[PDB]
């Protein structure tokens, strides 16, 4: 229960649609109400999974 309470006390994530990927772990994403962005990926996700 304490492990359940600490993980919920954390800022939420953003949802954004990927247009298409760049090279070397970079993509091209407009969020919802902003310009587009070139960001970095995490460990568990890959370029070929996009």
């Amino acid at each position: 229960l304490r492990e359940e309470l600490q993980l919920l006390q954390e800022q939420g994530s953003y949802v954004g649609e990927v247009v298409r990927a760049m090279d070397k772990k970079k993509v091209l994403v407009k969020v919802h109400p902003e310009g587009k962005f070139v960001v970095d990926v995490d460990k568990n996700i890959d370029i070929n999974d996009v």
Partner: protein, 413 residues
């Protein structure tokens, strides 16, 4: 009484006939298409490299100066100024998207060049004016100032000896002899519409005067006037009719003004509302208060019936040049234009060809000239014969203009 499926009878089918090579040929095709995939993700060589210079010149900048241009450099914004007050700054400044502040000048400014309506560099924290700016020029009229010559001479607009004569009077002659109009006491017209059947030569006369202009010429893309936002298209009209007043005697060519407004109605309470606001803004900067002076407007359409009578009034569009079909002397001149630069027999006559194109346009005549050479490539020739053109007339016109009158013709001979 027809049923022929039961799970035991399924095993009859896939063992009868090539039990040797059925799966033996199939999974070879299956895993190679899997291997088409597994090469692609193993390559992964997309490489969208952009932005970077050649890596042999920026080495001096990105040693310390780039780190020197992070923290001391400023992310200041540009704004506009309403006014000022005496003995103090008391500067009133808007953004038109953000709020309106009342701020102070900084130390690096001269307090004289803080005139009203001026773009100025504004701090992010205390919002002080730092750097004044040159004024904004409109970005999309620069995109449509042509700055380029399309190569069509007046010798290619044959069949129109009098329509060019009307069009020479309005455009070319006051720009080169602005004397005889005043020295007799007349004024030239300032708006010419072009109307008629399609493919007749509307664009050619506009393309040929862009060659011999010696003046400012502006092509205007028609559907840039129609925008997504409300009132945005009407603002695009204004910036066009301001910079024309700055320089002297600039030409503005619209094209297919059927699209940007043809009729003003309201019965179902709605519809093309935003199109009407852009279209009526075009009218009030065409006639009204503050007449424009030396701005000549050319328009061209295919459907002149469906246009607004507010544009049909002279004073906005003054000369109605129409294009018709060339009778015989026009067409015989057109064949000599479009077939002089091609390998033909040097003894053929063209007046027999101009007979067989009774109701035809300049586009249809050129299509006959291109098609006749295509018959020469159906055979193995390098020059065109008389029967090459005679089959081309039947291919272009007679294959679509008549099918009952040619076989059952015996009412006319």
């Amino acid at each position: 009484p027809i049923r022929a499926l039961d799970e035991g009878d399924i095993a009859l089918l896939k063992t009868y006939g090539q039990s040797t090579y059925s799966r033996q040929i199939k999974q070879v095709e299956d895993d190679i298409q899997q291997l088409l995939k597994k090469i692609n993700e193993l390559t992964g060589i997309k490489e969208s490299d952009t932005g970077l210079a050649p890596p042999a010149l920026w080495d001096l900048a990105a040693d310390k100066q780039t780190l020197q241009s992070e923290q001391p450099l400023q992310v200041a914004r540009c704004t506009k100024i309403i006014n000022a007050d005496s003995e103090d700054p008391k500067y009133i400044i808007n953004v038109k998207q953000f709020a309106k502040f009342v701020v102070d000048l900084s130390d690096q400014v001269a307090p004289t060049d803080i005139e009203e309506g001026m773009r100025v560099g504004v701090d992010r924290n205390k919002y002080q004016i730092h750097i004044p700016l040159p004024p904004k020029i409109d970005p999309t009229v620069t995109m449509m100032q042509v700055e380029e010559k399309p190569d069509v001479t007046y010798s290619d607009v044959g069949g129109c000896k009098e329509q060019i004569e009307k069009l020479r009077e309005v455009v070319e002659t006051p720009l080169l002899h602005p004397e005889r109009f005043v020295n007799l006491g007349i004024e030239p017209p300032k708006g010419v519409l072009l109307f008629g059947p399609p493919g007749t030569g509307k664009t050619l006369c506009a393309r040929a005067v862009a060659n011999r202009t010696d003046a400012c010429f502006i092509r205007v893309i028609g559907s840039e006037l129609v925008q997504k936002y409300v009132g945005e298209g009407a603002r695009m009209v204004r910036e066009l009719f301001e910079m024309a007043r700055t320089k002297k005697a600039c030409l503005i060519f619209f094209d297919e003004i059927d699209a940007i407004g043809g009729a003003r109605f309201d019965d179902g309470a709605g519809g093309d509302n935003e199109v009407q606001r852009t279209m009526l803004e075009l009218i009030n900067q065409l006639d009204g208060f503050d007449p424009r002076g030396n701005i000549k407007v050319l328009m061209a359409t295919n459907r002149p019936d469906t246009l607004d009578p507010a544009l049909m009034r002279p004073g906005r569009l003054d000369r109605k040049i129409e294009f018709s079909l060339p009778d015989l002397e026009g067409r015989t001149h057109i064949f000599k234009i479009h077939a002089r630069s091609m390998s033909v027999e040097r003894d053929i006559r063209f007046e027999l060809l101009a007979r067989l194109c009774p109701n035809s346009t300049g586009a249809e005549i050129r299509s006959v000239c291109t098609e006749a050479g295509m018959f020469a490539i159906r055979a193995r020739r390098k020059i065109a014969t008389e029967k090459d053109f005679l089959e081309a007339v039947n291919k272009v016109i007679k294959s679509y203009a008549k099918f009952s009158a040619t076989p059952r013709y015996m009412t006319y001979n």
